[PDB]
Design brief:
Distance between the termini: 4 Å
Strand content: under 5%
Number of helices: 2
Order of helices and strands: HH
Helix content: over 70%
Shape: flat
Number of strands: 0
Structural class: mainly alpha
């Protein structure tokens, strides 16, 4: 949920689902 971590999520995981799951937490 924090911009830092979710940015890193969308950055590291370009995969829609992996990104969803990471951003889910971040």
């Amino acid at each position: 949920h924090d911009p830092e971590k979710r940015k890193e999520c969308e950055k590291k995981y370009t995969d829609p689902k992996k990104r969803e799951e990471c951003k889910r937490k971040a």
